[PDB]
Amino acid sequence: ATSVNERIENKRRTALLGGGQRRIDAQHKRGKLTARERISLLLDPGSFVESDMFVEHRCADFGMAADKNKFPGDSVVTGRGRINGRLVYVFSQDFTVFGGSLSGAHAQKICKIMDQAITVGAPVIGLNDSGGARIQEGVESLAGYADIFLRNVTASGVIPQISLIMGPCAGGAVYSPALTDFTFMVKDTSYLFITGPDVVKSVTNEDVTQEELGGAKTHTTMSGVAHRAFENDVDALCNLRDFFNYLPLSSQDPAPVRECH
Amino acid sequence: YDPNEKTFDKILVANRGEIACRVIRTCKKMGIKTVAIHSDVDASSVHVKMADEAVCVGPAPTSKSYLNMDAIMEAIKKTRAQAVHPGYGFLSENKEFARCLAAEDVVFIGPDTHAIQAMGDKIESKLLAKKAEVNTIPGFDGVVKDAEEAVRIAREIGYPVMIKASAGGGGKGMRIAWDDEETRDGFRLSSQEAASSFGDDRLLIEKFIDNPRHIEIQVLGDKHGNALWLNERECSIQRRNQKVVEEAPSIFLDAETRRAMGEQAVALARAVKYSSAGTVEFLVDSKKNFYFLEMNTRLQVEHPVTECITGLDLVQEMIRVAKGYPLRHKQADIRINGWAVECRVYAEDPYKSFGLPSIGRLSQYQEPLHLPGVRVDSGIQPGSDISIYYDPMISKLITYGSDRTEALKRMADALDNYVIRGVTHNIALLREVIINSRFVKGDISTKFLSDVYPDGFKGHMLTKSEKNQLLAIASSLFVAFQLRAQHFQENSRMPVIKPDIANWELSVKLHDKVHTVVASNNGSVFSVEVDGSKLNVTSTWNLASPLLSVSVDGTQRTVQCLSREAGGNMSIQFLGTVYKVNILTRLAAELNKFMLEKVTEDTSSVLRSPMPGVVVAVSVKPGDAVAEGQEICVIEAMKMQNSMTAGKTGTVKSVHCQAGDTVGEGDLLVELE
Amino acid sequence: DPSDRLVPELDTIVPLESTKAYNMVDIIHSVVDEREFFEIMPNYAKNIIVGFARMNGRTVGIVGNQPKVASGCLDINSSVKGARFVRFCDAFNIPLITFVDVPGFLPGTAQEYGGIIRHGAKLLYAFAEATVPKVTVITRKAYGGAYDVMSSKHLCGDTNYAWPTAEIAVMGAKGAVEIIFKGHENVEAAQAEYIEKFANPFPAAVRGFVDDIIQPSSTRARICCDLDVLASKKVQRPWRKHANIPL
Ligand SMILES: CCC(=O)SCCNC(=O)CCNC(=O)[C@H](O)C(C)(C)COP(=O)(O)OP(=O)(O)OC[C@H]1O[C@@H](n2cnc3c(N)ncnc32)[C@H](O)[C@@H]1OP(=O)(O)O
Numbered sequence A: 001a002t003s004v005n006e007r008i009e010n011k012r013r014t015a016l017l018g019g020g021q022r023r024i025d026a027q028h029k030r031g032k033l034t035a036r037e038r039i040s041l042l043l044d045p046g047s048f049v050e051s052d053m054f055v056e057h058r059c060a061d062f063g064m065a066a067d068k069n070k071f072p073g074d075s076v077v078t079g080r081g082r083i084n085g086r087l088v089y090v091f092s093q094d095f096t097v098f099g100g101s102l103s104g105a106h107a108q109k110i111c112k113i114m115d116q117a118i119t120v121g122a123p124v125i126g127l128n129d130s131g132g133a134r135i136q137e138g139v140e141s142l143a144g145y146a147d148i149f150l151r152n153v154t155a156s157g158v159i160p161q162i163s164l165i166m167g168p169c170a171g172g173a174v175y176s177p178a179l180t181d182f183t184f185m186v187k188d189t190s191y192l193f194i195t196g197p198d199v200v201k202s203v204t205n206e207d208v209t210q211e212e213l214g215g216a217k218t219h220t221t222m223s224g225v226a227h228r229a230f231e232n233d234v235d236a237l238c239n240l241r242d243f244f245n246y247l248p249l250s251s252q253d254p255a256p257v258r259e260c261h
Numbered sequence B: 001y002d003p004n005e006k007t008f009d010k011i012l013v014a015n016r017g018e019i020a021c022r023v024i025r026t027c028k029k030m031g032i033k034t035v036a037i038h039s040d041v042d043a044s045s046v047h048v049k050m051a052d053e054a055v056c057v058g059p060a061p062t063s064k065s066y067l068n069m070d071a072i073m074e075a076i077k078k079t080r081a082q083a084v085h086p087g088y089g090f091l092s093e094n095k096e097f098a099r100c101l102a103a104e105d106v107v108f109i110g111p112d113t114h115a116i117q118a119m120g121d122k123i124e125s126k127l128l129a130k131k132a133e134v135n136t137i138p139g140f141d142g143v144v145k146d147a148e149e150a151v152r153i154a155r156e157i158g159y160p161v162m163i164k165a166s167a168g169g170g171g172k173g174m175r176i177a178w179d180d181e182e183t184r185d186g187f188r189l190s191s192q193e194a195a196s197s198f199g200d201d202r203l204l205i206e207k208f209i210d211n212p213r214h215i216e217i218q219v220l221g222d223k224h225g226n227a228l229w230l231n232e233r234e235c236s237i238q239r240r241n242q243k244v245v246e247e248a249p250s251i252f253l254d255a256e257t258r259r260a261m262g263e264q265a266v267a268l269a270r271a272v273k274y275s276s277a278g279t280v281e282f283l284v285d286s287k288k289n290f291y292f293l294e295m296n297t298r299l300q301v302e303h304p305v306t307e308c309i310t311g312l313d314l315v316q317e318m319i320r321v322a323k324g325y326p327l328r329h330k331q332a333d334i335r336i337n338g339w340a341v342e343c344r345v346y347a348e349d350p351y352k353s354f355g356l357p358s359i360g361r362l363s364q365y366q367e368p369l370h371l372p373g374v375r376v377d378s379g380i381q382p383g384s385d386i387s388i389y390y391d392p393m394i395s396k397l398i399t400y401g402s403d404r405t406e407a408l409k410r411m412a413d414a415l416d417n418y419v420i421r422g423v424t425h426n427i428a429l430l431r432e433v434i435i436n437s438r439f440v441k442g443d444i445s446t447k448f449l450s451d452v453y454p455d456g457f458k459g460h461m462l463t464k465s466e467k468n469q470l471l472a473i474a475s476s477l478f479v480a481f482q483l484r485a486q487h488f489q490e491n492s493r494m495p496v497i498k499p500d501i502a503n504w505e506l507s508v509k510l511h512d513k514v515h516t517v518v519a520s521n522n523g524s525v526f527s528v529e530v531d532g533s534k535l536n537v538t539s540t541w542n543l544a545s546p547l548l549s550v551s552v553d554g555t556q557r558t559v560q561c562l563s564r565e566a567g568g569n570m571s572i573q574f575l576g577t578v579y580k581v582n583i584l585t586r587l588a589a590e591l592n593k594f595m596l597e598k599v600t601e602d603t604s605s606v607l608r609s610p611m612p613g614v615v616v617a618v619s620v621k622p623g624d625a626v627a628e629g630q631e632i633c634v635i636e637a638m639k640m641q642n643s644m645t646a647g648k649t650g651t652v653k654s655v656h657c658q659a660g661d662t663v664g665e666g667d668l669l670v671e672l673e
Numbered sequence C: 001d002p003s004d005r006l007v008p009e010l011d012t013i014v015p016l017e018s019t020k021a022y023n024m025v026d027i028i029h030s031v032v033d034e035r036e037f038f039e040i041m042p043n044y045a046k047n048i049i050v051g052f053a054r055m056n057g058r059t060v061g062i063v064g065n066q067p068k069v070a071s072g073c074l075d076i077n078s079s080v081k082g083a084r085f086v087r088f089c090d091a092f093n094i095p096l097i098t099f100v101d102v103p104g105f106l107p108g109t110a111q112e113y114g115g116i117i118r119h120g121a122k123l124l125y126a127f128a129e130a131t132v133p134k135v136t137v138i139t140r141k142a143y144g145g146a147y148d149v150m151s152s153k154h155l156c157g158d159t160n161y162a163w164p165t166a167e168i169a170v171m172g173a174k175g176a177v178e179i180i181f182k183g184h185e186n187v188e189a190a191q192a193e194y195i196e197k198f199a200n201p202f203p204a205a206v207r208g209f210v211d212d213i214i215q216p217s218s219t220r221a222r223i224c225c226d227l228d229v230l231a232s233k234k235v236q237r238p239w240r241k242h243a244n245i246p247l
């Protein structure tokens, strides 16, 4: 008798449930979904296939060798699907597990998805919901951003890259959306800033909150970083679907032609 | 040196810089472990890396790092040091330091406490010397009483009247008077300045010697009552009462006078019961009459030069004496072997006040160790930094030869192959003094720098032939750079066509004059036409090395190109002096005459500080009116205080200097109309 | 000018204290041939330095941080100033030499309202798409994602070096201890342990992030030899009409 079957089911249940039901309830109380139903709403029904669902982080310092600091998926859901019959590769970040902070496995999965997409010639859509880089990981975390950043420059001009900020992205993770072709934000829910208001108050002796520092209105009215702002998650995904419907798959293909009346 | 003999196994050096390095080298040669002390600024000095172990003693100021006895004693106790060498300065001649060290168990390399106590003030030293049958100044001995007593003394001491501050000296309270009324007014001025002095409030009246010559006798003694005099030393070239150029054998003295001086010095040392190395200083007139003047109970700065004519090592001998061993030499064993000349290279600008301190970081530094008969003693290295708290001494250079002429020629050669980039030095003044006709002849005095340059040091005044050589070298260097700029690699797509030019016609602007130069190249040989004069210069034309050796008409010269730019400005070091020239082509020079002259909004009325440091006292306030020749404020940096002069009349609009702040070099200080 | 000339004056140029500022122009002058350096835009955005020099007779582009001005923090102007120069140097086949001393990006409301993200992305892209040989030397520090912005090893960099006084981390010690050891409410021993363990280049050295830790006096001799072996660099990349600069 082998217990390799029940462990698979337990790992699947933990991956679906994330880091716990209390964090899920906290996610919903802000009027905010989680990664998996975002993916389901974005993609066609019964067309999403997920890659690398059994990957764990390999941290060994600051007491993460215990099971309480171990979570399957490593706060990222990556895969491929179809929109209106055309292939696409997607990745979404989960704030439940360590606030979506970058780890080795997170960057590895993102890089693998980008490599596959650039190999086959399909667009990449990224739903960004993070909190920065994991400090306990160390320099290994920083390299992850680099391993992403290079792949954002290699694929620039080859395949379209779309980014949608769905939460408070901060730190060095804000540079990946700036290196993509288009940027979209959800108002009253998403933020973008290099440093938090606390550091600004400490250094420049100036008082400001997160909404006025990195809010959607600031980045869509005077900063010029984002392109459009949407009311909520469902409207954002609905608009992103037809926006993707406009644009082609790769620079080797001609502009799409539809049926006119 | 014999390492078999028993000697201390741990020496702590209580100094910094050059003398610490010298002592460290000596004990390393003698196989003795050493310990070094340093402040926070000197944590990266040369002497803290040469010596095993290092102890931090406190902050940057000397009052808390090198003069803090508690820190030194704690370091000695922690390091289990058995002996301490003070070098010179700081605590070398401190009365309480000797007792504090000799209390527990520590032996102090130097004179005993009684010797320092006796030779510490100018009152009892004179009477002690008189009791030892030593020639002294015929000035009256005794503390002055009042103006009437002062003039009564001045009646029978001679028409020239010296007034001096007792006890501590250092160039304070030293004043002149001739006339009896002038004598009494100078005496009351001396009395009031002594009342405002450090506290002695005692004056000494004395006689002047006309055209003084400062001679020194190096004495060495032990604890068994033996005393030796190691020849004499000539030190007359001084500014601000500080020696710059040293000469071991005295060209002014014969055998009999030298013997008499040495015997008198030995007798004086025996009277004091001296048991270490020291120097006795004398003032000598034209009639070879020598008078005693002060005794230094420590190791002197100019000690290496007398080592070049005797072959002894003073540091090793004095360490052996402090150990308790009798001297292994006799008087008949000391002989003069050749000639030796020493120069003291400082970090200061000689063009103002014969040297004013400057700071900076050494971009690069190279010594002429490959030249024959050259020895360099330095406590610096490439990348070293110069702070504002210590003496600005960079290094000392010693050259020895068979006779005076060879030593002087070697010194002149060595002063040209010395590379210092990063700070300003006084090498030009040294080279000008060395090749001076009066210095070569041998008629010098303590006022040598006061009459040769009555207004100040203006650089080397070069003759017509030297000017032609300089212009030819500059033109040749410019043409060599232009020719080097044309050498590319083969492209195989757009081949380069090297321009074919025969002659280069150039306009060279030097000082405030313009010369026309024609340059021709024939490989490694340049032919130069300078105002109708033929010159021929050859060299390897290595444009990367900091030293260029050229031959102009058979004469060998060494030059250094300090700075060069595309605008034509070049800074070239010729004969130890830096010259600025502007080289242009004929067409460029002709077209440059149409350029409008750039307005320069600096016509006096500016009092930019000539030296960095901390101002201690400002004598004016904003809105006041100043007068010519009146000091404004006093800035203290590198052991000295300097007050800038005046010469224009106006109203000070603002004052940017306050007591306790730090002022950088070239910073605007006083603004006036 | 020999290619193996030593530069002993660079051994103690970097102060021991982390709050003191030095001059990178002195290091550039010491390293390059004949102390000659042609600076571009010397009076604008003084916290970054860009220029042309020669190494063993070969034209090179020098880019570096200036700790003397604004502690070396990056801002809007310096990002564009460096990015344009790097793009030109790549476009006309010129090797790049980089000196890294950066604590991060300059914070404030004006920088965020001006779009610092776009210009940081410009500079990062300019270093990322570089195909000419690149040599990087880290002098004192490189904090946060800015370390990636300065052509780290992971952006297809060829050779990276670090001086013994260098140190690389994620953030400062205070931020790390206040974001990791929050429950312990004791930063006395925690800060000491963090600065003893991570305030040094070994964590990046043991993980292969930096090629070697070299003495400063041998910096020049290390660079020239590298420029001898990287002169034949060739990189193949996917075809495209032109990429999308974040202009
Ligand atoms: C390359 C440049 C870098 O390295 S940037 C590194 C990030 N530096 C920082 O100072 C962290 C900034 N992040 C934040 O302030 C918050 O997470 C923001 C973005 C405001 C989210 O808002 P908020 O809902 O109030 O957060 P929260 O109180 O619910 O905390 C949730 C949990 O997320 C975690 N988290 C966040 N970021 C990291 C990170 N980089 N590394 C490790 N953990 C992180 C927090 O530990 C927090 O834990 P907890 O559940 O509150 O106990």
Ligand SMILES: Nc1ncnc2c1ncn2[C@@H]1O[C@H](COP(=O)(O)OP(=O)(O)O)[C@@H](O)[C@H]1O
Pocket (backbone or CB within 6 Å): B137, B162, B169, B170, B171, B206, B207, B208, B209, B212, B214, B241, B293, B294, B446
């Ligand atoms: N009686 C004197 N007569 C003529 N010149 C003197 C006399 N005393 C001093 N001078 C000058 O004073 C200067 C310094 O005298 P000194 O006793 O050595 O003090 P210090 O220890 O500060 O050097 C000498 O160089 C000398 O030129």
Ligand SMILES: *C(=O)CCCC[C@@H]1SC[C@@H]2NC(=O)N[C@@H]21
Pocket (backbone or CB within 6 Å): B088, B089, B090, B242, B301, B389, B390, B391, B639
């Ligand atoms: C300051 O750092 C003390 C050492 C420098 C002065 C010492 S002591 C007196 C000697 N005369 C001189 O010019 N240097 C020597």
Ligand SMILES: [Mg+2]
Pocket (backbone or CB within 6 Å): B294
């Ligand atoms: Mg004296």
